[PDB]
Design a protein around this ligand. Structure first.
Ligand code: GDP
Ligand code: GDP
Ligand code: MG
Lengths: 151, 280, 292, 95, 217
């Protein structure tokens, strides 16, 4: 089974911004943080930094991101792309893809050996490297959701 | 747009009102029943304002009893109704037709139409068009008749038809109805023919929605009911008492993607409907 | 797992109307065309996926009723789990009805004294609304004084009619007295209610749409179960028009009606309106194999 | 006064046609979703290149260690420290 | 064969039963006989597949202008109920060019509760030429006379829909007609048959009640 409250708390915690103290470099929070399916692309769980219209728009954006990701997961040509960051944690291989949606930076990563995806959307000023590190450290703590498939 | 119900005693006006409106312009307002017995009509007994305040007059004829005198009384009513106001739409319901054959029903409607036309020719009224509907309480006929009568009193009909046609063409919707929350009187549809079976499906969907919502209260009505063959039925409350019920077919697509695009399209349609003051 | 239910009464009491509406899927207007049941009509109805119900729609007329307690007494009243006696309040021979019920109770005590007796005061729509409940009391006390006489310390009765939803409650409580492993179903339902954080979870049967169990066993309507059963029967009969079968129903993203298995339907009312539909649907699909 | 009502009806017809055209322009089909092309792969360097292209040679010439080695490690540590997210409990519950 | 998307339209737009987009699949000229089969190989009876002949006609101006796919539109009412297909389905189209060779042989008709002269039957048959009909199609003559096509025959087969040509033997059976009965009262009426029944007992107990029950049915 699944627990919506703990996943909601995790997605709310992944909306936390960065405030560096050694170097004065403040970053804004992410626009949205959600977990979606790898089959239909609809929202399993979601969280926003800051109502029905935004939920429908976020579902549309999740559908668009999964539609773009489906062809990228099934393509082996041009595999040495600069926007792909395939990380392997705990002997589980996955592929992370970053995309630009007009003025939005959207980073998606398939949870390894499972039919789920994790998506972080931030503003255009957000750096891509910090998003990659954020999604890597987020996937590091999601070992309990490994091997989960839809029924 | 207040409609006036007229007819002889024990013709069924109160029963029609109880069934439809109990289970402004467009909302199901408190209509006025008028028991009209056979008599001599008083000339201008302060009734000019009353008939000037009626958007469309509705007459009820009992098909079980003899009705030639009823048609004579109806012609007498029209004789001053059209004289006072030349913009009133005139409606006649042939009520209590549940236990009649199709050929008998068609012949009865033809006889009633011919008699009314001949009486109006005798009375010298010209340029008047009286509509006729075969109605009964026990079936969908009275709902459709009141739907046509109400549709004759909404000036924005073609624009709503275009909006619903565009919504249907861009969401794979089989059939979309713009019901009202009470009386199940559908206000607008597409250019596709109003199937009776689909109309009954949508009406009983309205009933299931309202009853289930009323069972759990005291803590914007939305509904998705998916069948085995992927055909979904969707409900979203529009402005004031209006609601939208759409039968949408998947056509071998993703259920959640179709639901998302239908939700976005219907929210856009509701935002467009906010601009036009079609509510209430 | 064969359960022998007896459905007895007087002439015209509406036993076959109950059997047709609850199980054979007939409307209220379609029970007028029913004929007179001659002798005993047996119906083998499959409940859930393991239960089979042998419902005995008995005759109810005087020759049949005198035949039951004289010659066939060693056949109709042996290995009986539930008797359902249908009393018509339109009857002018109420003492004869009570005597027939007394003979039936005597035979059941003689042959299978572990059975369960239920009484349904049918046709309680012709009486005026003010005098209904008192009338239901006025007979029931007498029936209790009858029921405690021939064994049977407990007797449950229901004011029933085919033009309201009380029939569903009466038949649901009659059937649920035979369903095995009710405690396990209640415990699993409580676990699922705690897991999904739901206000109320109700488990039905798919075909008959009778209530099987509830999570709870803001003030709510005490007769909500039977009303939901009637609404679901109407919705199934509506969805039969579109040449398909009802699968799911989501209301306000708060009320989920879902085909839990091939034999049950779940009715979940949650607390938070902001949960996405796919999470609830996925948790429903995970519990699909759990209740099997 | 009825000519003013005729002009008002003409304005109403224009307004209703404009409303129909406005609500017709936001309709999205599934073909628009599948072949949108909005979701494109973007990197920081490519975004900077596009910004310079819209706004509009070897510049660099090849020639402390402790301070840079300390600051780089401290910046990486501060980046990795705030990315550590602790769950408020188990994610999947059993029966 | 071709492929088309089914459509439905109300009587406000067009009065014709079947309309097809003449701009699409331009092999078909305006005057043609077109099959509307819903099956492409291996016809299915349990699933439900029918062949419905019709005569080609173009879309209405309002429907063609404010168009929404639907290469073939069927008027609602009886033809839609006969076909029993959803609002957007896949159908097939042929261009059978032998109008003379595809004539139905016998097309039935019913003239209940109305007096048609013999010449009236001739005129009504003359109006039913180069026009395809189907089963239980309620034709109308002079807006009051009702018909019913209860049987279309071709090569010994009772086809669901047929084409009426110049050499089609259309018959007009009457469901409300005058009847004369001539009962012979002879010495044989009180005789007994081999089973043990009198012949007039058969006449008044088995023949007349059966014929009256059949007439009422
Ligand atoms: N069978 C049938 N009876 C009807 C119908 N409409 C009305 N009635 C009969 O009309 C009676 C009610 O008439 P009512 O509304 O009180 O007449 P009013 O007070 O003059 O409007 C009832 O007893 C019904 O039996 C109908 O559609 N079908
Ligand atoms: N009005 C009304 N009629 C009922 C009710 N229950 C049964 N009936 C009538 O009972 C008749 C059929 O009775 P039936 O089931 O055959 O009695 P049984 O043979 O003794 O079981 C139908 O015509 C119904 O109209 C009720 O609650 N209200
Ligand atoms: Mg019976």
């Amino acid at each position: 089974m699944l627990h919506s409250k703990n996943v909601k708390g995790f997605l709310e915690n992944t909306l936390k911004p960065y405030d560096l103290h050694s170097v004065d470099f403040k970053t804004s929070s992410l626009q949205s943080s959600m977990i979606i399916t790898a089959t239909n692309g609809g929202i399993l769980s979601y969280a926003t930094s800051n109502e029905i219209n935004s939920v429908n728009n976020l579902k549309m954006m999740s559908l668009l991101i999964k539609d773009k990701w489906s062809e990228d997961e099934n393509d082996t040509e041009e595999q040495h792309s600069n926007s792909c960051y395939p990380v392997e944690i705990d002997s589980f291989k996955t592929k992370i893809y970053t995309y630009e949606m007009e003025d939005l930076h959207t980073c998606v990563a398939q949870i390894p050996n499972s039919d789920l995806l994790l998506l972080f959307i931030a503003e255009g000023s957000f750096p891509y490297g910090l998003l990659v590190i954020k999604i890597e450290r987020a996937m590091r703590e999601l070992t309990d959701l490994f091997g989960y498939k839809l029924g | 747009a207040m409609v006036l119900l007229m007819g002889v005693r024990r013709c069924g006006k109160s029963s029609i009102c109880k069934v439809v409106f109990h289970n402004s312009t467009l909302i199901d307002l408190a209509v006025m029943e008028l028991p009209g017995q056979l008599n001599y009509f008083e000339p201008s007994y302060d009734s000019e304002r009353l008939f000037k305040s009626v958007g469309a007059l509705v007459y009820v004829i009992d098909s079980q009893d003899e009705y030639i005198n009823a048609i004579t009384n109806l012609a007498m009513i029209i004789e001053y109704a059209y004289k006072v106001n030349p913009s009133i739409n005139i409606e006649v319901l042939i009520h209590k037709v549940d236990g009649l054959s199709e050929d008998f029903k068609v012949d009865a409607q033809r006889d009633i139409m011919q008699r009314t036309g001949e009486e109006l020719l005798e009375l010298g009224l010209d340029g008047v068009q009286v509509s006729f509907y075969l109605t009964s309480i026990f079936d969908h006929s009275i709902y459709e008749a009141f739907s046509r009568i109400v549709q004759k009193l909404i000036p924005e009909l073609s624009f709503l038809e275009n909006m619903l046609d565009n919504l249907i063409q861009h969401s794979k919707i089989e059939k979309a109805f713009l019901f009202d929350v009470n009386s199940k009187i559908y206000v607008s549809t597409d250019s596709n023919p109003v199937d009776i079976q689909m109309y009954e499906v949508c009406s009983e969907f309205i009933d299931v929605t309202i009853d289930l919502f009323d069972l759990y209260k005291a803590p914007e009505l939305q509904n998705v009911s998916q069948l085995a063959n992927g055909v979904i039925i969707y409900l979203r409350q529009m402005i004031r008492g209006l609601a939208l019920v759409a039968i949408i077919r998947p056509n071998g697509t993703d259920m959640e993607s179709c639901l998302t695009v239908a939700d976005y399209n219907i929210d856009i349609f509701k935002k467009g409907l906010e601009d036009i003051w079609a509510n209430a | 797992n064969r359960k022998k239910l007896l459905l007895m009464g007087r002439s015209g009491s509406g036993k076959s109307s109950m059997r047709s509406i609850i199980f054979s899927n007939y409307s209220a207007f379609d029970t007028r065309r029913l004929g007179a049941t001659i002798d005993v009509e047996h119906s083998h109805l499959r409940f859930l996926g393991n239960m089979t119900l042998n419902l005995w729609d008995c005759g109810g007329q005087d020759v049949f009723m005198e035949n039951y307690f004289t010659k066939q007494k060693d056949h109709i009243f042996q290995m009986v789990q539930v008797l359902i006696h249908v009393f018509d309040v339109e009857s002018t021979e109420v003492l004869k009805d009570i005597e027939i019920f007394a003979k039936a109770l005597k035979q059941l005590r003689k042959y299978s004294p572990d059975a369960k007796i239920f009484v349904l005061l049918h046709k309680m729509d012709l009486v005026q609304l003010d005098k209904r409940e008192e009338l239901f009391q006025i007979m029931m006390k007498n029936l209790s004084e009858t029921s405690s006489e021939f064994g049977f310390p407990n007797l449950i009765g229901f004011p029933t009619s085919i033009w309201d939803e009380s029939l569903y409650k009466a038949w649901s409580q009659i059937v649920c007295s035979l369903i095995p492993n009710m405690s396990n179903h209640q415990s699993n339902l409580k676990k699922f209610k705690e897991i999904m954080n739901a206000l109320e979870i109700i488990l039905f049967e798919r075909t008959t749409f009778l209530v099987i169990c509830s999570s709870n066993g803001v003030l709510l309507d005490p007769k909500r179960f039977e009303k939901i059963s009637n609404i679901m029967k109407n919705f199934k009969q509506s969805c039969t028009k579109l040449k398909s079968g009802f699968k799911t129903l989501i209301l306000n993203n708060n009320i989920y009606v879902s085909e839990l298995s091939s034999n049950m339907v779940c009715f979940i009312v949650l607390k938070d309106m902001n949960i996405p539909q796919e999470l609830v649907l996925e948790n429903i699909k995970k519990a699909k194999e759990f209740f099997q | 006064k009825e000519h003013e009502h005729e002009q008002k009806l003409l304005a109403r017809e224009q307004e209703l046609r404009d409303i129909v055209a406005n609500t017709n322009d936001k309709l999205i089909d599934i073909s628009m979703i599948n072949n949108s092309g909005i979701v494109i792969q973007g990197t920081d360097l490519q975004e900077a290149l596009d910004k310079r292209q819209q706004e509009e040679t070897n510049t660099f010439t090849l020639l402390s260690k402790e301070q840079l080695k300390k600051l780089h490690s401290n910046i990486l540590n501060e980046i990795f420290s705030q990315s550590q997210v602790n769950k408020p409990g188990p994610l999947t519950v059993p029966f | 064969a071709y492929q088309a998307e089914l459509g439905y339209h109300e009587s406000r737009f067009s009065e014709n039963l079947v309309m097809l987009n003449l701009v699409e699949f331009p092999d078909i000229k305006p005057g043609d006989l077109v099959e509307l089969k819903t099956y492409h190989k291996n016809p299915s009876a349990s699933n439900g597949d029918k062949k419905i002949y019709f005569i080609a006609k173009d879309f209405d101006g309002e429907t063609k202008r404010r168009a929404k796919t639907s290469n073939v539109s069927i008027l609602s009412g009886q033809l839609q109920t006969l076909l029993d297909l959803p609002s957007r389905s896949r159908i097939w189209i042929k261009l059978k060019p032998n109008k003379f060779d595809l004539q139905a042989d016998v097309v039935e008709f019913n003239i209940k509760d109305c007096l048609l002269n013999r010449g009236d039957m001739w005129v009504l048959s003359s109006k039913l030429v180069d026009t395809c009909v189907f089963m239980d199609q309620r034709l109308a003559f002079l807006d009051s006379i009702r018909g019913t096509i209860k049987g279309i025959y071709r090569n010994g087969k009772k086809i669901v829909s047929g084409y009426i040509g110049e050499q089609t033997r259309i018959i007009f059976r009457s469901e409300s007609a005058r009847l004369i009965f001539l009962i012979q009262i002879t010495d044989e009426m009180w005789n007994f048959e081999e089973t043990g029944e009198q012949l007039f007992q058969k006449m008044v107990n088995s023949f007349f009640p059966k014929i009256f029950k059949k007439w009422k049915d």
